[PDB]
Amino acid sequence: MKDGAVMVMSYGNSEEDGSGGSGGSGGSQDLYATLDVPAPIAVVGGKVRAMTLEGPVEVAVPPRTQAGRKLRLKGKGFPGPAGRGDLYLEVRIT
């Protein structure tokens, strides 16, 4: 188990049609950053690297992801001294 690292959570594994469940908003517990994903890796799949709060991390994207796609990481935003929240990675097609 790797608590101080990033998972394959990208698509937002939701039993629903499409969900993410964003939180920690307003009080700066949440975090937004971009992730640069190639179009072939966005459509087919592949791991891409994201510079986050913690540092360089490993983010495997879904085989349908699109420009603007919010890859929700839950409890992976700002730290507990700041107030623990969640972090989103906005897919940029390149």
State the strand order across the main sheet: 1-5-4
Q: What is the name of the CATH topology of the domain at 31-93?
A: HSP40/DNAj peptide-binding domain
Quickly give the CATH architecture of the domain at 31-93. Answer: Sandwich
Strand content: 25-35%
SSE-based structural type: mainly beta
CATH class of the domain at 31-93: Mainly Beta
Radius of gyration: 13 Å
Number of helices: 1
What is the 3D form? globular
The CATH superfamily label of the domain at 31-93 reads: Urease metallochaperone UreE, N-terminal domain
PDB class: chaperone
Keywords: Client Recognition, chaperone
Assembly: monomeric
Entry title: Structural Basis for Client Recognition and Activity of Hsp40 Chaperones
In words, what does this structure look like?
- It is found in: Cytoplasm.
- This is Chaperone protein DnaJ 2.
- The protein has 94 residues and is mainly beta.
- The protein has a domain at 31-93: Urease metallochaperone UreE, N-terminal domain (HSP40/DNAj peptide-binding domain, Sandwich).
- 5% of the residues lie in helices and 32% in strands.
- It has one helix and five strands, in the order E-H-E-E-E-E.
- The protein has one helix at 39-43, and strands at 31-37, 46-51, 56-61, 70-73, 87-93.
- The chain has a three-stranded mixed sheet. A two-stranded antiparallel ribbon has the order 2-3.
- Strand 2 (46-51) and strand 3 form a beta hairpin.
- The radius of gyration is 13 Å and the shape is globular.
